[PDB]
Write a protein that binds this ligand. Structure first.
Ligand SMILES: *[C@@H]1O[C@H](CO)[C@@H](O[C@@H]2O[C@H](CO)[C@@H](O)[C@H](O)[C@H]2NC(C)=O)[C@H](O)[C@H]1NC(C)=O
Ligand SMILES: *[C@@H]1O[C@H](CO)[C@@H](O)[C@H](O)[C@H]1NC(C)=O
Ligand SMILES: *[C@@H]1O[C@H](CO)[C@@H](O)[C@H](O)[C@H]1NC(C)=O
Ligand SMILES: *[C@@H]1O[C@H](CO)[C@@H](O)[C@H](O)[C@H]1NC(C)=O
Ligand SMILES: *[C@@H]1O[C@H](CO)[C@@H](O)[C@H](O)[C@H]1NC(C)=O
Ligand SMILES: *[C@@H]1O[C@H](CO)[C@@H](O)[C@H](O)[C@H]1NC(C)=O
Ligand SMILES: *[C@@H]1O[C@H](CO)[C@@H](O)[C@H](O)[C@H]1NC(C)=O
Ligand SMILES: *[C@@H]1O[C@H](CO)[C@@H](O)[C@H](O)[C@H]1NC(C)=O
Ligand SMILES: *[C@@H]1O[C@H](CO)[C@@H](O)[C@H](O)[C@H]1NC(C)=O
Lengths: 363, 189, 49, 64
């Protein structure tokens, strides 16, 4: 009270000095019985990658995605994430993840990013400015390069316009550079739009092949199917806990509800769009979520000119959660509740007042 | 031949439980009192999404074809209800002029909504009849397919969805029991 | 409607609270209206923005 | 190396066209590409190097 009022001498009255908050005692985590591991091995340890002009988009779903396997392998030269930190990928759960697989030169790796330009960014593989996900790449000089040159990897050099985000153009129509039609035939100012990469084991790093996998992560108002390597814990009810339900997190007290969710509904919201119910992702029971109690803390004091004894009111909150007197205004501790009705001195609320009398604080 | 859609074509826009509340949502819905084409086979436009309904006793309608060419060449989405289940494929199927792979999945007034990934909502009720009900999602198909036209495989009605604003009324049990089309008339506004 | 003068006060105050609470769902240019989600995705220097 | 040089050539072609504000520049760059493409296919190192050096000067003129 003295610090709140910035005074050594405190006058008689009731002052709000702080906030009471019930703290969580444990953290409950629940996931469905998915023992499937996400097929990253089929992407990262694949024997063949697609050409950049015709990249391979594989969808990942209904599996456990352990990203420590990739992140901490140190087998990658590039691991750049946008909209997400690479160290939190295991905590997040996604509606899906897309793995876009292709081969480019080492000097072109910088083009695989939002906001970038260049023949790859513009004609082969375009990422949106608001791209969310991680770009992972590694040197594949000992995999794709061949002594006589590996020419099985194509890229687009010519196009009529730039690509839209995630647009895949695999047309082989002869590009018209000049004023006359090509009619599908190469010749004067007419060129096949795709060029090969001359990948050789003796190339300098800029010209060595790199295998690139772009993991696009979708975080939408929809159920996760791709979820990190987290264990489920026991369900705890009627206590203040932290929680995680398929990536849905918060702090609160959970109780069994009488709400009837439709067969397709996973969670509910109140009239102000605040989550107030969840379907446990294991037993499929519906629980209500109510926030852990909190309220202002007020100090009821006689002036420090008379006494340094104080009583403390915890607003709203029950005495079972915090001379203990439960009243409508909150839980009042330190004041003695008496039968005798006196003229009001320090008001508390809901008809209750307190005073210092023959001496101690009474309510 | 056209009929009055009345107040049909409403569905749960998401998978969130709500109750005793009026929720304002922006999505593709069949506009209230719009016209639906009455068929009693052809390839029809898909547009933004499709409202489909049928009234059958013999249960002749079996499925739908969705795509851009519906003639090999590229991928088409084939959804067929046969015997005890529904088989869904996205192969480069060669279809007949009169019909009746990257993804495969296996699962009276019947209302359906087909919209773009591709989601399917439906409602089945005993007895285009006037009244109100909401359709609910029964399958989510995570398919990267371009759909501009579709064909019905064997009376039925076809309407089209629009980016229409709706106010939906959820009852105590979280069921949508009523709705307002915010662009139908001044009173609804 | 006779007591509308008292009801109007109740409605205005209740409306003010509903308006305030609903603002928590707004992004204000952020990647998410939910603070807990921002902190579950981004590292400190990016989350701060 | 001829393959590294070919890759340099196509990088220069892309950039040279990218900054080719006028049409005459585009025409010259396309001609240079075609000559390099033929030289590459026929393993003519000197013609391929010549085009690359010419493209570098062309691009420098466009940028500076
Ligand atoms: C889906 O496929 C159709 C073609 O069946 C695409 O429509 C064409 O788009 C081009 C480019 O704008 C136009 O020149 C053609 O005239 C259109 N044809 C028709 C029949 O409309 C459509 O753009 C594709 N959609 C997506 C998302 O890929
Ligand atoms: C790829 O193979 C290596 C073999 O040493 C293994 O350590 C790594 O975890 C594998 N990556 C994936 C995604 O399976
Ligand atoms: C998970 O396994 C338990 C048995 O240990 C079972 O009771 C529960 O219903 C299963 N849940 C799911 C989603 O498979
Ligand atoms: C406050 O303390 C002073 C002594 O410094 C005393 O004279 C005065 O009467 C006291 N007032 C009250 C209300 O206790
Ligand atoms: C406090 O909790 C008890 C149950 O243990 C309940 O009977 C009582 O009414 C509660 N009081 C308040 C103010 O919530
Ligand atoms: C009021 O007096 C009765 C005895 O007559 C006692 O049982 C009750 O606890 C008293 N109330 C308070 C707040 O002390
Ligand atoms: C439906 O079509 C008829 C013509 O057959 C037309 O008169 C009527 O106004 C149309 N109704 C709507 C809602 O478009
Ligand atoms: C339905 O057709 C599929 C082939 O598309 C077949 O595999 C399935 O067994 C058939 N089911 C019944 C019940 O006939
Ligand atoms: C909710 O379901 C119960 C049956 O458990 C039913 O009696 C009640 O009328 C339903 N409420 C509404 C608003 O339909």
């Amino acid at each position: 009270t003295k610090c709140t009022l910035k005074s050594f001498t405190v006058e008689k009255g009731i002052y709000q000095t702080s906030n009471f908050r019930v703290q969580p005692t444990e953290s409950i985590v629940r996931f469905p019985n998915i023992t499937n591991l996400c097929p990253f091995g089929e992407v990262f340890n694949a024997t063949r990658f697609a050409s950049v002009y015709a990249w391979n988009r594989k969808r990942i779903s209904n599996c456990v995605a352990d990203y420590s396997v990739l992140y901490n392998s140190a087998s990658f030269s590039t691991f750049k994430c946008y909209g997400v930190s690479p160290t939190k990928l295991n905590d997040l759960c996604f509606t899906n993840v897309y793995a876009d697989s292709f081969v480019i030169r080492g000097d072109e790796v910088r083009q695989i990013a939002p906001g970038q330009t260049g023949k790859i960014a513009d004609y082969n593989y375009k990422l949106p400015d608001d791209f969310t996900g991680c770009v992972i790449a590694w040197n594949s000089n000992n995999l794709d390069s061949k002594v006589g040159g590996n020419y099985n990897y194509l890229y687009r050099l010519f196009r009529k316009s730039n690509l839209k985000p995630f647009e895949r153009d695999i047309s082989t129509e002869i590009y018209q550079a000049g004023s006359t039609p090509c009619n599908g035939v190469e010749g004067f100012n007419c060129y096949f739009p795709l060029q090969s990469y001359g990948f050789q084991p003796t190339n300098g790093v800029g010209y060595q092949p790199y295998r690139v996998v772009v993991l696009s992560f979708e975080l939408l108002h929809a159920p996760a199917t791709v979820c990190g390597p987290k264990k489920s814990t026991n369900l705890v009810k009627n206590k203040c806990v932290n929680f995680n339900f398929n990536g849905l997190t918060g702090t609160g007290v959970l109780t069994e509800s009488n709400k009837k969710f439709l067969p397709f509904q996973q969670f509910g919201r109140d009239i102000a769009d605040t989550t107030d119910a969840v379907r446990d992702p294991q037993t499929l029971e519906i629980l209500d979520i109510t926030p852990c109690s909190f309220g202002g803390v007020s100090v009821i004091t006689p002036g420090t000119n008379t006494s340094n004894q104080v009583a403390v009111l915890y607003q709203d909150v029950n005495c079972t959660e915090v001379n203990v007197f439960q009243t409508r205004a909150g839980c009042l501790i330190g004041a003695e509740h008496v039968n005798n009705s006196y003229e009001c001195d320090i008001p508390i609320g809901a008809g209750i007042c307190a005073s210092y009398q023959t001496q101690s604080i009474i309510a | 031949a056209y009929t009055n859609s009345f107040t049909r074509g409403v569905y749960y826009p998401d998978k969130v439980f709500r109750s005793s509340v009026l929720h304002s949502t922006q999505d593709l819905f069949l506009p209230f009192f719009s016209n639906v084409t009455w068929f009693h086979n052809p390839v029809l436009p898909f547009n933004d999404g499709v409202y489909f309904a049928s009234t059958e006793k013999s249960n002749i309608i079996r499925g739908w074809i969705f795509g851009t060419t519906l003639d090999s060449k590229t991928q088409s989405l084939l959804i067929v209800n046969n015997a005890t289940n529904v088989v869904i494929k996205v192969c480069e199927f060669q279809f007949c002029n009169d019909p009746f792979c990257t993804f495969e999945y296996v699962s009276n007034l019947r209302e359906f909504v087909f919209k773009n990934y591709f989601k399917i909502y439906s409602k089945h009720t005993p007895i285009l009849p006037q009244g109100f009900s909401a359709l609910e999602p029964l399958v989510d198909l995570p398919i990267g397919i371009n759909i501009t036209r579709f064909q019905t495989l064997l009376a039925y009605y076809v309407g089209y969805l629009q980016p229409r604003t709706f106010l939906l009324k959820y009852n105590e049990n979280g069921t949508i029991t009523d709705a307002v089309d915010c662009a139908l008339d001044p009173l609804s506004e | 409607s006779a007591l509308g003068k008292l009801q109007d006060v109740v409605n205005q105050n209740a409306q003010a609270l509903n308006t305030l609470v609903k603002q928590l769902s707004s992004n204000f240019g952020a990647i998410s209206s939910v603070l807990n989600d921002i902190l579950s995705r981004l590292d400190p220097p990016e989350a701060e923005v | 190396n001829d393959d590294e040089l070919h890759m340099l050539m196509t990088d220069l072609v892309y950039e040279a066209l990218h900054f080719a504000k006028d049409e005459e520049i585009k025409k010259r760059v396309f001609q240079l590409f075609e000559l390099a493409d033929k030289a590459y296919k026929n393993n003519d190192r000197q013609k391929l190097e010549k085009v690359v050096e010419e493209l570098k000067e062309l691009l420098e003129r466009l940028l500076s």
